[PDB]
Enzyme design. Structure first.
Site, PDB file in Angstrom:
ATOM      1  N   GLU A  52      -0.435  10.500   2.751  1.00 49.12           N
ATOM      2  CA  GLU A  52      -1.269   9.577   3.570  1.00 49.12           C
ATOM      3  C   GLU A  52      -1.111   9.973   5.034  1.00 49.12           C
ATOM      4  OE1 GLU A  52      -0.437   5.498   2.078  1.00 49.12           O
ATOM      5  OE2 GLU A  52      -2.391   5.909   1.166  1.00 49.12           O
ATOM      6  N   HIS A  56       6.960   5.889  -0.170  1.00 49.36           N
ATOM      7  CA  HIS A  56       7.036   4.699   0.693  1.00 49.36           C
ATOM      8  C   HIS A  56       8.112   3.766   0.177  1.00 49.36           C
ATOM      9  CE1 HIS A  56       2.685   5.392   2.112  1.00 49.36           C
ATOM     10  NE2 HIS A  56       3.578   6.196   2.778  1.00 49.36           N
ATOM     11  N   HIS A  68      -2.919   1.067  -9.080  1.00 49.51           N
ATOM     12  CA  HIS A  68      -3.186   1.953  -7.907  1.00 49.51           C
ATOM     13  C   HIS A  68      -2.012   2.874  -7.629  1.00 49.51           C
ATOM     14  CE1 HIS A  68      -2.323  -2.112  -6.086  1.00 49.51           C
ATOM     15  NE2 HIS A  68      -1.484  -1.422  -5.316  1.00 49.51           N
ATOM     16  N   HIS A 119       2.236   7.989  -3.225  1.00 45.80           N
ATOM     17  CA  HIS A 119       0.821   8.369  -3.169  1.00 45.80           C
ATOM     18  C   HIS A 119       0.774   9.865  -3.429  1.00 45.80           C
ATOM     19  CE1 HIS A 119      -0.206   4.470  -1.170  1.00 45.80           C
ATOM     20  NE2 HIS A 119       1.028   4.657  -0.721  1.00 45.80           N
ATOM     21  N   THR A 143      -1.284   0.527   3.931  1.00 50.65           N
ATOM     22  CA  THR A 143      -2.326   1.578   3.699  1.00 50.65           C
ATOM     23  C   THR A 143      -3.216   1.207   2.526  1.00 50.65           C
ATOM     24  OG1 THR A 143      -1.038   2.948   2.213  1.00 50.65           O
ATOM     25  CG2 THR A 143      -0.786   3.336   4.604  1.00 50.65           C
ATOM     26  N   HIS A 155       7.203   3.197  -3.888  1.00 49.67           N
ATOM     27  CA  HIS A 155       6.081   3.792  -4.622  1.00 49.67           C
ATOM     28  C   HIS A 155       5.697   5.076  -3.954  1.00 49.67           C
ATOM     29  CE1 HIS A 155       4.254   1.508  -1.365  1.00 49.67           C
ATOM     30  NE2 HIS A 155       3.381   2.542  -1.343  1.00 49.67           N
TER      31      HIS A 155
HETATM   32  N1  LIG Z   1       1.298   1.834   1.077  1.00 44.66           N
HETATM   33  S1  LIG Z   1       2.187   0.860   2.000  1.00 44.66           S
HETATM   34  O1  LIG Z   1       3.565   1.282   1.973  1.00 44.66           O
HETATM   35  O2  LIG Z   1       1.570   0.747   3.303  1.00 44.66           O
HETATM   36  C1  LIG Z   1       2.178  -0.753   1.295  1.00 44.66           C
HETATM   37  C2  LIG Z   1       3.371  -1.466   1.255  1.00 44.66           C
HETATM   38  C3  LIG Z   1       3.390  -2.732   0.710  1.00 44.66           C
HETATM   39  C4  LIG Z   1       2.258  -3.315   0.188  1.00 44.66           C
HETATM   40  C5  LIG Z   1       2.283  -4.702  -0.416  1.00 44.66           C
HETATM   41  C6  LIG Z   1       2.532  -4.594  -1.876  1.00 44.66           C
HETATM   42  N2  LIG Z   1       2.953  -5.885  -2.425  1.00 44.66           N
HETATM   43  C7  LIG Z   1       4.140  -6.106  -2.963  1.00 44.66           C
HETATM   44  S2  LIG Z   1       5.199  -4.931  -3.106  1.00 44.66           S
HETATM   45  N3  LIG Z   1       4.515  -7.259  -3.458  1.00 44.66           N
HETATM   46  C8  LIG Z   1       3.697  -8.464  -3.589  1.00 44.66           C
HETATM   47  C9  LIG Z   1       4.442  -9.758  -3.466  1.00 44.66           C
HETATM   48  O3  LIG Z   1       3.971 -10.707  -2.882  1.00 44.66           O
HETATM   49  N4  LIG Z   1       5.677  -9.714  -3.944  1.00 44.66           N
HETATM   50  C10 LIG Z   1       6.675 -10.658  -3.412  1.00 44.66           C
HETATM   51  C11 LIG Z   1       7.609 -11.104  -4.509  1.00 44.66           C
HETATM   52  C12 LIG Z   1       8.274  -9.913  -5.141  1.00 44.66           C
HETATM   53  C13 LIG Z   1       9.586  -9.983  -5.611  1.00 44.66           C
HETATM   54  C14 LIG Z   1      10.224  -8.859  -6.107  1.00 44.66           C
HETATM   55  C15 LIG Z   1       9.557  -7.655  -6.153  1.00 44.66           C
HETATM   56  C16 LIG Z   1       8.245  -7.572  -5.712  1.00 44.66           C
HETATM   57  C17 LIG Z   1       7.583  -8.697  -5.210  1.00 44.66           C
HETATM   58  C18 LIG Z   1       6.125  -8.590  -4.777  1.00 44.66           C
HETATM   59  C19 LIG Z   1       5.882  -7.307  -4.012  1.00 44.66           C
HETATM   60  C20 LIG Z   1       1.063  -2.605   0.252  1.00 44.66           C
HETATM   61  C21 LIG Z   1       1.010  -1.331   0.814  1.00 44.66           C
HETATM   62 ZN   LIG Z   2       2.253   3.280   0.164  1.00 44.65          ZN
END
Ligand SMILES: NS(=O)(=O)c1ccc(CCNC(=S)N2CC(=O)N3CCc4ccccc4[C@@H]3C2)cc1
Ligand SMILES: [Zn+2]
Length: 258
Positions: free
Chosen positions: A104, A117, A62, A94, A196, A92
């Protein structure tokens, strides 16, 4: 039949699997610059990225994420609207299929070509997965991109994208300095909101910088050569991976500046 950004699985569908999609503090939003009020109670914003340790870049189907080592307080966001210390875990973007769309957040309904972001988690919750279950678990620093002059600090990202074209691909990405992605001014808007993307959790303090960064048309054209699909699947260009503006409901957007 997983969520995404197609006609059949895009943002208007997400509420069926993630009913919080119609919740009270969803993101992104339109920032009405005339209604946002200056808040003199906002403390100064502190972006401390000198010791940031990037590890890897991943195409997750995505977007692409640049991930950091967050196992100590090396790169942190503090101050502004925030109580305590938020550790940088990933960034990341968008972006759009055309320069006229991709962000966004919007500003007086203006869409930018892309939005960065920088994702941070509140260290009082111990790990990221615990932080996303809390209303103050995350702080996301949002930065608009407009097409004009190249951003020199972006080019190392642009040049690795050929190695992570498809979903599930990753590459080593050490020693990347995210200070190269910041604009000159840290003037911002802030409001309480959500992720988001699914799971759309209501855990984010949003901090959206007013000053966009400039990137070149060739830089953003390289983002648009990525794929949503995995290797050995039909090619679908990774473009228009943005959620549109959601209702503001019972929220106020605060400005850090007069
Ligand atoms: N578009 S936004 O900025 O609103 C947005 C921000 C963040 C997210 C969640 C994305 N999930 C993310 S970024 N995760 C999943 C996880 O459990 N771990 C936790 C463990 C870990 C360790 C090192 C490096 C990465 C991780 C990932 C990161 C989704 C959407
Ligand atoms: Zn984002």
């Amino acid at each position: 039949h997983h969520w995404g950004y197609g006609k059949h699985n895009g943002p208007e569908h997400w509420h069926k699997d993630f009913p919080i999609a119609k919740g009270e503090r969803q993101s992104p939003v339109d920032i009405d610059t005339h209604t946002a009020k200056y808040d003199p109670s906002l403390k100064p914003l502190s972006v401390s990225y000198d010791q940031a340790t990037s590890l890897r870049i991943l195409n997750n189907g995505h977007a692409f994420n640049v991930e950091f080592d967050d196992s100590q307080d090396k790169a942190v966001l503090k101050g502004g609207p925030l109580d305590g210390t938020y550790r940088l875990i990933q960034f990341h973007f968008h972006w759009g299929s055309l320069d006229g769309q991709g962000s966004e957040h919007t500003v007086d309904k203006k869409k930018y070509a892309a939005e960065l972001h920088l994702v941070h988690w509140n260290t009082k919750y111990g790990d990221f997965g615990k932080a996303v279950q809390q209303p103050d678990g995350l702080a996301v620093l949002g930065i608009f991109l407009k097409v004009g002059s190249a951003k020199p600090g972006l080019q190392k990202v642009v040049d690795v994208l050929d190695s992570i074209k498809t979903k599930g691909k990753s590459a080593d990405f050490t020693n990347f300095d995210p200070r190269g992605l910041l604009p000159e001014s840290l003037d911002y808007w802030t409001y309480p909101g959500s992720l988001t993307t699914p799971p759309l959790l209501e855990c984010v303090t949003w901090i959206v910088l007013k000053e966009p960064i400039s990137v070149s048309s060739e830089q953003v054209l390289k983002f648009r050569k990525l794929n949503f699909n995995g290797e050995g699947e039909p090619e679908e260009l990774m473009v228009d991976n943005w959620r549109p503006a959601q209702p503001l409901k019972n929220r106020q957007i605060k400005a850090s500046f007069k």
